[PDB]
């Protein structure tokens, strides 16, 4: 083994000037980016960890002229609804929720079990410990505060691959037959779908044939770089810089699915 | 008390997540509280308003983690038990949060305030503090409602919260600082199940509520017993209507009507026998239903 | 032994009512015997006859009061169980009755005693005397059947018994000498709840049961859990037929068919997933079902 210590910042936090908090739930495993864009570089050459240290800090950076709550502990189950409802949520330790205009500290008891990071999927619960939480009820008016991730990693065997990611579509099918970030749905009225399941800065790279109706264009996204036609036959290309997991960008070619094919590298 | 006082801009607490603790045979188990019983939100008004919520081993809508070990006995106890109003918000903010039990835990919450300021419980305070509640717990061995009853023989009271305030925000949460004892091994409850055969009916497997019907038809759907509730039932002409409410806590109907359906329903009781009803003709003959606690 | 010997005419036992017997947390309660597990029925013929009844902390047709504390837990132990023929049979009547129990709690009794005579247990003995059977028991954390399963993984082994005799009589009676372990503590149960909505089903509250069908439609009505049960449930178009049965135990059909009924049914199963089924069209809606376990 080798191992690590945290220094990450992971999506904040919005207002709430409503009376049910809302939830931002965020996942924990060595490569989940959407809770580590600079550590999920040094997990595509082992596979197994530890955790010996990991907090997050609600950074304080607010005035007090603004109030409510912002919910913030950890459950090991890092995987399953949030509630719908605070009493629920405090009651799953963690504990700790302190008003915006304070820094706060947050800790969780860490395991001792070899546990294996997702070169996918399998099971949300045999691969990572559990995903985080972050809730904040309140209705003065701010852009409340910020937080990490303190942690200390042990990364044993010694393995090294990975990437995002190239998926072809067969004019009967698809074809994502080869490690992921994004699923690509369509809405029916044909207007596509060009999504995410990884977060991070990207580089596309891509798909072709009959260059219709648009393309790329994207919607909950982060910035978009397109050098291409729109094709009909050509190439093209995009930067993205994702918020929090899942946003999405999409073509326009019609109406029952058979095109081309395209690549995603993860950068 | 003296001179100084610092009023800050934000006080706030940091509570965790209580992990429970238990006892032999005797001829009884134990508890200890954990729960965070619904909040209160604003009331920037001049008359406070109240969210009386209802106190009985089995009550959800006041108790979510220990109405899952009641459906093996049937008695108890109480020896600890307190209502801490967080505090989770600025200072920047006012008003009050009143919070006092009355054993006699069901009976309308007063219109106004000297009124509830003239029972016990005693405390309120202003929100962007940290208050506790306590009450002075009893010792007889009281049942808990596998139903209806009455709601004084089988539970103390309900709780009480009220705030009156304009100042803005979304004040705190409380729960329940407390330490049970559950007699007499028993074991069973759901959300109860009872049939009408045409000429007859069927409540022959454990009670809340009792049937009846104001001629008219326009009818009766009770209880017996009191906490929140996980209706879930009967069926085949779903005419008139079905479930609806009156004496009654929140409902919850994701149904048809159904003339043939399926229902469903969340209650919230207040004092012991709370009604609901349907509406179908004439004269009984129906279809099924099954009450489970909860 | 040797000289002398006394088959008497007569020979008789007097048992009484065990009264039951309990422990702290540490992370479990306790238990011990007294059930009387069902009898046997003469044999005046050649080749033995057995009732093999299964062993699982729920299942009822093996503890009918005992399967009213494990709506509360999850996981078992044994440190104690046997089986006694009382003896309330005159020697006046003779044979054997068989009774030994094999782990593999589930597969087919043979066919045949020499098949019965080379399955430990051990020990049959004539009806006219008083004999006991006992059991090497292990120290596995197993489960018990909130269904269905597999029935090998959720408990030891079914119990036999046979009898093979001629000479004429009510043999005699048995039950458990035992004392269990009941670790985690969980809590519910009845006979599960499971609907079908026109576009899919809904199973989605605690299973022992996994309902498939065959195409021609004749169709499943299936288990994953093993014991006796009490069935209750479900309705609309009252076809075709609706419980029948095929591997299984003990049945009780008290409805009508339906087209929009209700009915009604106990199970008594063998290993591990037995079926049983409904005979309506073609594909899949209908109406609703509960499975209880008891």
């Known amino acids: 083994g080798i191992t690590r210590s945290g220094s990450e910042l992971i999506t904040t936090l919005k207002k709430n000037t409503d009376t049910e908090p809302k939830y931002t739930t965020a996942v924990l495993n060595p490569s989940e980016p959407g809770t580590f864009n600079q550590l999920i570089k040094e997990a595509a050459q082992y596979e197994k960890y530890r955790f010996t240290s990991l ?13 409510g709550k912002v919910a913030l502990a950890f459950d090991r189950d890092a995987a399953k ?32 079990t070899d546990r294996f990071v997702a070169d996918g999927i399998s099971d949300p619960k045999l691969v990572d410990f559990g995903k985080l939480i972050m809730a904040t009820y309140g209705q003065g008016a701010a852009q409340l505060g910020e937080v990490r991730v303190e942690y200390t990693v042990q990364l044993k065997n010694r393995t090294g691959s990975t990437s995002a990611q ?20 369509g809405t029916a009225g044909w207007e596509h779908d060009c999504h995410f399941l990884g977060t991070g800065n990207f580089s596309l790279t891509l798909f072709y044939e009959k260059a219709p109706v648009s393309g790329l264009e994207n919607a909950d996204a982060s910035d978009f770089s397109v050098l291409g036609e729109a094709a009909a036959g050509s190439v093209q290309w995009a930067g993205v810089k994702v918020a929090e997991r899942g946003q999405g960008v999409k073509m326009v070619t019609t109406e029952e699915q058979p095109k081309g094919k395209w690549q995603a590298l993860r950068i």
Do not use: H
């Open 55 to 67: 907090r997050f800090r609600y950074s304080p950076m607010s005035p007090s002229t603004t109030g």
């Open 81 to 112: 609804p949030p509630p719908n409802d605070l009493a629920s949520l405090y009651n799953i330790e963690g504990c700790v929720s302190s008003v915006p205009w304070t820094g706060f500290i947050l800790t969780v008891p860490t395991d001792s």
């Open 166 to 185: 190239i998926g072809d579509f067969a004019g009967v099918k698809d074809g994502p037959r080869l490690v992921s970030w994004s699923k690509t749905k």
